[PDB]
């Protein structure tokens, strides 16, 4: 999945 700060 995506990192904590992604998007």
């Amino acid at each position, epitope marked *: *999945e*995506l*990192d*904590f*700060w*992604a998007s």
Partner: antibody
Amino acid sequence: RITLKESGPPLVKPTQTLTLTCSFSGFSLSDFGVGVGWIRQPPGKALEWLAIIYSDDDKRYSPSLNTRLTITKDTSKNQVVLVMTRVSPVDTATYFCAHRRGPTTLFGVPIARGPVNAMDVWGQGITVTISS
Amino acid sequence: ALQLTQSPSSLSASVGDRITITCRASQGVTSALAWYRQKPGSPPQLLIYDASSLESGVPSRFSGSGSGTEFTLTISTLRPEDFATYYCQQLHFYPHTFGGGTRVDVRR
């Protein structure tokens, strides 16, 4: 100044459980968006990411080691603990814990996440040998 | 999972050279990439964060560029303390992968 230091048993036998402790100073695991992760390095090999925990208590693990790892934090003692179960010889490596910065803020408002893209301060690392 | 490939795996150089190490990821990782220098018996040290930002206290000879799937670290004027192993780390997807590393040693 941020500093971290790993502690635990230098020797562990196969099938046993390994508990590693990261004690730190200079930041709190109650600080906004902060993280503490664990990385290992078998002798002569590359770095391998293991897990990370954030102050809001979100936890993430290496998929390959997921079933054997548990990471937890004790905010009041400024410690992060990593528990690895059923270790085997391939787990002998130097284990490092490291700090991950939260976003830059202005008047308590995050304005830059760029700082989170790295583990900026590392502990000296602790050597763990797994042998019966 | 995501793959991070460093090139070259090993590299020879001399004090004063300009070297460039590159790291390619299998899927785009935006700018979430960091570079570290590791001297034997020592922990990795952060050089560049967020693909190109110079970490505080790190000498200017270090530079990082790139985004997406291709990144490069260049040391403009190699110093003796730079003979070491360098690693790139991706922090866009979990797990936060490290590259295989590239060893920079004294050429002869």
